[PDB]
């Protein structure tokens, strides 16, 4: 759907796909897996699309979480939305 | 041992282009014979196409390796309607001598 992203593609692949598929081999080497990834730059440039493509391909669920709609204005809902998600 | 993708790469002309030589024809031929699990068809393509094809060492080594695996794969294919069958009969059908057959049939 988007091309020319070779360098970011390769990056994402090793970050995201591989610990889910092949958990055993990180712990067998005895080095830390990656666990968190940050994507920085403007979204919706083809960025979001890679995320979405891996999610389908690995047959993982896509969960789209609005970080900014935690921005609730009290002690009520928001900090508990985080538990459940 | 993944015959369908050999066929897929053939079928489109963005993965084959305009490129036909004796060597490319050989791979198509070997693939068909692999799928059928027949050593005879493999031998006929191997011989005709030989000089251009196996004129590079890298291919020639894989054809060697493949000829063995195919040979055992034929042996298993023939027997597959089931045994109580004579080692003389198999030997004639496959194209080979008695001894080579006995030793490969044990390994299998």
């Amino acid at each position: 759907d988007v091309g020319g992203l070779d360098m970011q593609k390769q990056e994402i692949r090793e970050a995201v796909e591989l610990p889910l598929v092949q958990a055993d081999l990180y712990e067998q080497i005895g080095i830390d897996p990656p666990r968190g990834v940050l994507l920085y730059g403007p979204p919706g440039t083809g960025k979001t699309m890679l995320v979405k493509a891996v999610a389908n391909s690995t047959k993982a669920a896509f969960i789209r979480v609005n970080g900014s709609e935690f921005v609730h204005k009290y002690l009520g809902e928001g900090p508990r939305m985080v538990r459940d998600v | 041992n993944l015959i369908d993708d050999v066929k897929n790469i053939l079928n489109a002309k963005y993965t084959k282009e305009t490129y036909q030589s004796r060597g490319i024809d050989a791979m198509k031929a070997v693939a068909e014979a692999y799928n059928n699990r027949s050593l005879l068809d493999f031998n006929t393509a191997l011989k005709q196409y030989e000089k251009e094809l196996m004129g590079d060492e890298l291919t020639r080594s894989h054809f060697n390796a493949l000829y063995d695996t195919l040979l055992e794969s034929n042996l298993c294919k023939i027997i597959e309607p089931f045994e109580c069958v004579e080692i003389s009969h198999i030997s004639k059908i496959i194209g080979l001598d008695t001894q080579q057959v006995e030793g490969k049939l044990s390994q299998m």
């Binding site: 080497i29 005895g30 | 044990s106 390994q107």
Partner: protein, 400 residues
Amino acid sequence: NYEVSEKAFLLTQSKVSIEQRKEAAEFVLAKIKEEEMAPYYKYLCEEYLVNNGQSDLEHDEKSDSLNEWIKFDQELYNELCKKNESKIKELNEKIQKLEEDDEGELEQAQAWINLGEYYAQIGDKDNAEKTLGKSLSKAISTGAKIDVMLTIARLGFFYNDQLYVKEKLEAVNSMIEKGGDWERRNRYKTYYGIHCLAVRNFKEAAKLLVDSLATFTSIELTSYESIATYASVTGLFTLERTDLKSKVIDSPELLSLISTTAALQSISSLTISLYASDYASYFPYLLETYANVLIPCKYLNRHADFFVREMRRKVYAQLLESYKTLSLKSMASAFGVSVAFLDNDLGKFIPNKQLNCVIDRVNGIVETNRPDNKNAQYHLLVKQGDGLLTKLQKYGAAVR
């Protein structure tokens, strides 16, 4: 540490080839009286008295060596003592000053590490251990564990102990941190191979020993040659021929090894033999290997004819499955064995459930039946159920 232990073992376990015992006795002699190790020299001298090959001279005549000194001797107590004085005096002054000042928590450990050197070297077990174990209690770096781990090892080879060596090996390994760390793993891996070959389960040994991630030496925890030969040899004995062509002639480490030595007859000759499926080739080679590699070794001497019997069984077996109505007159004549040998050791194999060979010994004919059947599983299932059952009666003997 290892070359001393190794050549003392080699020395006593000698009865063939002059230069082996001679060269052994010289290195042991040179090192053991430089080193403060009296009690193994004693043991050596006890174990190698009234033997052939003597290099002891106190009453003997049975000597074939050209060195007439490996007897427990009084020169020992001048070389050992001036060294023991020096070392005790240095270390006494050193431990006192470091511990007074209270500088750091890591100088303290260096001060107790010096007594574990001292003490393994004189050959005390329990003093060496509890002096070092302080460092582990004052754990503040993983270093403390490395000294714990090294000391069990040294002592281990000298005594030739499986059991408290296994116990301490497990306890220090499992502990707080665990890690993929290189020489904790190299040491754990050889030592596990030692013990399980000793129990005679043999498969469990194979699972760690055959596999090696150490392409270079670990000096005193084993020689590169030594581990490597041992892994290939266990490889052959206790693993399948489907395994052999997978891993035990097709690991890239073995390839750099077979380059320069093939006298191991198990990284070459027996592996090739096994693949090719022969038994005209095999049995000659095995005897030559037994003498050249098993009997020099500290670990594979103790498993003698068991090692022999199961390998001859495995080769007969891979032949027995491949054929059916099989001409024992033809085999017994020309696959490199004698007739009389072939029958009686075939028959030795059969009742133990080591072959489903359908024999007639003298009518010359053998046939084959399937190696598993419902009956075979039922018989061994029953074996394990009464194994289980007995231990619970024991639980209910002392408790209750």
